[PDB]
Amino acid sequence: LPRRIIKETQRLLAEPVPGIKAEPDESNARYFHVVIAGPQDSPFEGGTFKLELFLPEEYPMAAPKVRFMTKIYHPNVDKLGRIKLDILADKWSPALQIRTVLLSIQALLSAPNPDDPLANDVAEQWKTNEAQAIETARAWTRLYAMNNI
Amino acid sequence: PRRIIKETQRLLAEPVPGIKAEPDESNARYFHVVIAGPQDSPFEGGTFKLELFLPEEYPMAAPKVRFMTKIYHPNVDKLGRIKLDILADKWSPALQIRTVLLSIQALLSAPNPDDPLANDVAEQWKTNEAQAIETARAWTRLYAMNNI
Amino acid sequence: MQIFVKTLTGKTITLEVEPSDTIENVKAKIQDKEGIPPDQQRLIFAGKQLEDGRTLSDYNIQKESTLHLVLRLRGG
Amino acid sequence: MQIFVKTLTGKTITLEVEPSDTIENVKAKIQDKEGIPPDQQRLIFAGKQLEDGRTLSDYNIQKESTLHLVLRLRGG
Amino acid sequence: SAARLTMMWEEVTCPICLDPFVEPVSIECGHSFCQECISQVGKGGGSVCPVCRQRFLLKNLRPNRQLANMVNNLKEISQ
Amino acid sequence: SAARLTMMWEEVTCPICLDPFVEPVSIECGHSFCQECISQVGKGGGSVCPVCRQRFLLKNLRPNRQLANMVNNLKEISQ
Ligand SMILES: [Zn+2]
Ligand SMILES: [Zn+2]
Ligand SMILES: [Zn+2]
Ligand SMILES: [Zn+2]
């Protein structure tokens, strides 16, 4: 039970962030049940996206394991909800916390990057027909990312 | 000069045992100093008057300090000029009037004869340490007492 | 006008800004107090990654609004 | 017992010490808090430059006695 | 009163372990960390700053004792 | 608790100018000074630390922003 995890968990419950919820599992304080609000002025606006976060044993020297549990139409997230984000891999910082990681993921929904894709189909559709991809994502947000709590 | 004001401020407010330093009413850069001879030293019981002047480059340069009372010391000459590294090359701009005077007070406790400033006194201090001490204890009685 | 910035650790700093100020201006004030080069700063408000060009007014950031500080992130 | 040490700036630090402690032991505690190698420390008490060999008891340094810190000085 | 104390407590907090500084040291960028914390990050003789991502070498660590002293003071104030 | 309040003011005081730190920077030894103050001491490329007399080079100056922040905090407490 690294004390960092205790204090992080402590401040997430005490000092909450708008549009982000992260509660620990009573069975494993290293596993967090997360809900992310879709960023405004984004196809995902109005969505509530569920994510699983797990803290490996090397935390904070290694990034958390985070994957989407709700289905999402995004160039940088695949069918299993696995996320390709530098801060969760190569450009991780041990000064990042669960708070900033989740905000970072929220930023990614605001600023999709198709050029480097993880879901190649969605990425091409975003580039070939940006307007249709947006409409799809706005739909998927209503279908899968609403009434899901 | 704010440093001088704050230094002077703590000298008047929070004083150090055995050292007084008050500014001349005519020039805040010139200080009237009195140093108590250190105990377990030939100068014990003495009250030594010193002149301290703060040049304009203070604290980037050391104060100018000389003895006004006569002193028999290897590192102080007949004119009262002091040969002390902290007052020359080994000066530090973190040193203050307080620490300068304490340094000078330390020097009376621990004279360095080997390397001479007053060759007369220096040689006498190593060749006949006991006679030099007796002289210094005398000079303390003659010149460094009833001088207030 | 004073806005808030929640830094990495969670420490909240207060910054005097004007609604006409660019995001770049904000990063600079953050940099002077926290020492993070602007190319490493990203500011999040209402889930959006605020862009360097636009202004606080362009985002309807009013008095006592909190921005959240994050490090350079890239979706891949 | 606790003694006091007036550092260069004039700030007074508190040290937990034992009458049997050598001056070098004191310098070490000063070094841990102020970062001055003992080689460069000189401690003054009653106008005397306290030497590394002797102890606080050898100088009759009791509870709440203040030592004054100075830099290495050489009259030569 | 506590609110201002918190602001000061957060200034003497390590960004890695999130505890108050223990043996506070700085790297080339000027950001400070616990020696143990930054040492583990820089395992192998260097890495990047957790705060700004500027490169740092473990050999160029620098003590930041003022931060230490301010920690102890704040800890005593609580008492 | 003015005694402890002052003790904190003294931790953020420059040993050269004796004012609170302005652009606090550190030298190789870890000791901190106002940039202007230490720069004047080291004018011509460097010199010795005023506190421990260790050598320092002006190019190796390192910002110590925590000290700055602790100054501002303490300013708010007063007044
Ligand atoms: Zn730490
Ligand atoms: Zn840094
Ligand atoms: Zn200064
Ligand atoms: Zn130093």
Numbering used by the authors:
A (entry chain C): 4 to 152
B (entry chain E): 5 to 152
C (entry chain D), D (entry chain F): 1 to 76
E (entry chain A), F (entry chain B): 3 to 81
Could you share sentences copied from the article?
TRIM21 is further distinct in that it does not engage its target directly but indirectly using antibodies, which behaves as a natural PROTAC (proteolysis targeting chimera). These properties of indirect targeting and ubiquitination allow TRIM21 to inhibit infection by a diverse array of pathogens, including viruses, bacteria, and prions, by causing their proteasomal degradation and activating immune signaling. Antibody-dependent virus neutralization by TRIM21 is dependent on interaction with its canonical E2 enzymes Ube2W and Ube2N(Ubc13)/Ube2V2(Uev2). Here, we have described a general E2-specific mechanism of RING E3 catalysis, in which a tri-ionic motif provides conformation-specific anchor points that capture the Ube2N~Ub closed conformation.
Our attempt to unpick the basis of fine E2 specificity began with solving the complex between T21-R and a stable isopeptide-linked Ube2N~ubiquitin (Ube2N~Ub) conjugate. The structure was solved to 2.8 Å resolution with two full complexes (2xT21-R and 2xUbe2N~Ub) in the asymmetric unit. The overall domain orientation shows Ube2N~Ub in the closed conformation primed for catalysis bound by the two protomers in the RING dimer. While Ube2N only contacts the proximal RING domain, ubiquitin is bound by both the proximal and distal RING. The generic interactions present in our structure include the Ube2N S96 sidechain, which forms a hydrogen bond to TRIM21 P52 carbonyl, and Ube2N R7 sidechain, which forms a hydrogen bond to TRIM21 I18 carbonyl. The TRIM21 linchpin-residue (R55) contacts Ube2N (K94 carbonyl) and ubiquitin (Q40 sidechain and R72 carbonyl) simultaneously. However, we were particularly struck by the prominent involvement of three anionic residues: E12, E13, and D21. Residues E12 and D21 hold Ube2N in place via a cluster of positively charged residues (R6, R7, K10, and R14) arranged on the same RING-facing surface of Ube2N helix 1, supported by interactions with backbone carbonyls (I18 and L20). The final charge residue in the motif, E13, mediates a complex hydrogen bond network with ubiquitin via K11 and the distal RING protomer via N71, which in turn hydrogen bonds with the carbonyl of ubiquitin K33. The tri-ionic motif is perfectly positioned to capture the E2~Ub specifically in its active, closed conformation, providing ideally distributed anchor points.
